[PDB]
């Protein structure tokens, strides 16, 4: 009797799954850059000293 709702629910369910997938690729890239910041923060001057 509630099969119409279920069909609607599946359509309701479907839209959310799609939104998540596009976002994911961006997240991985940053990590080498995060490693970069530490070198930036350290003074060039010390390196010649040590």
């Amino acid at each position: 009797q509630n099969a119409k709702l279920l069909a609607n629910l599946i359509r309701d369910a479907l839209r959310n799954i799609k939104n998540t997938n596009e976002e994911a690729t961006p997240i991985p890239s940053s990590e080498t850059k995060a490693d970069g910041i530490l070198l930036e923060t350290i003074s060039v001057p010390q390196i010649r000293d040590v």
Partner: protein
């Protein structure tokens, strides 16, 4: 050229980070420890310092592995017959030659002898087989073959003393490694008739092993050359 070619254990090679000036831009060389090297801490005059120090007596080899440029150099020390090869240890994905120690109904436990290298050459693990110091591994009944994973007769697959080439899925516990012979290039390699009492047998079919000497045929799990 800045760092010595050959370093004895305890000899300083290169600091933590490095940089040079070329093409009007600073190129950052990132030094990372490797086989034969160990990043440790040394302090002079109340000053803390981290530098790559060799731990093995060998020639030293560097290799690059991965606006403003970016770089990564791998610093290692290579010794330079007798072979030791400790760095080599069974890890997920590696291929390992094993020997069947005992057969049970739901699984088959073995012992690790040698491990296949990467591009054949192998790394032999030297240990006493009459003690138990040798690494032990367990091949599950579901990991025997991809064909019919549920029902597998272990008696008709392996045999005590037979040499089996497998790939380790995971470390498991301290007792048993996880071994799979699911693919084609994995299975019983060297074996003899009647648990080693008869003559040598060779691999023909993937599920059949025959002996071109006494005409004996025993059911095993054979691999592909």
């Amino acid at each position: 050229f800045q760092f010595p070619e050959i370093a004895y254990p305890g000899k300083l090679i290169c600091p933590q980070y490095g940089t040079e000036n070329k093409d009007g831009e600073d190129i950052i060389f990132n030094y990372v420890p490797g086989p034969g090297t160990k990043l440790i801490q040394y302090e002079h005059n109340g000053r803390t310092l981290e530098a790559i120090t060799a731990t093995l007596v060998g020639t030293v080899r560097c290799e690059e592995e991965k606006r403003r440029t970016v770089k990564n150099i791998l610093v290692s020390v290579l010794p330079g017959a007798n072979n030791d090869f400790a760095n080599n240890l069974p890890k997920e994905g590696d291929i390992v030659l094993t020997r069947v120690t005992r057969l049970s109904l739901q699984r088959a436990n073995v012992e690790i002898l040698a491990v296949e290298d990467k591009p054949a050459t192998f790394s032999v693990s030297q240990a006493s087989s009459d003690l138990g110091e040798t690494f032990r591994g367990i091949i599950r009944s579901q990991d025997v073959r991809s064909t019919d994973r549920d029902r597998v007769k272990v008696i008709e697959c392996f045999k005590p003393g037979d040499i089996v080439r497998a790939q380790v899925l995971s470390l498991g516990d301290g007792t048993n490694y996880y071994l799979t012979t699911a693919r084609n290039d994995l299975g019983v390699v060297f074996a003899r008739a009647a648990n080693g009492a008869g003559g040598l047998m060779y691999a023909t079919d993937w599920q059949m092993m025959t002996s071109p000497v006494t005409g004996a045929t025993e059911k095993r799990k054979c691999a592909k050359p």
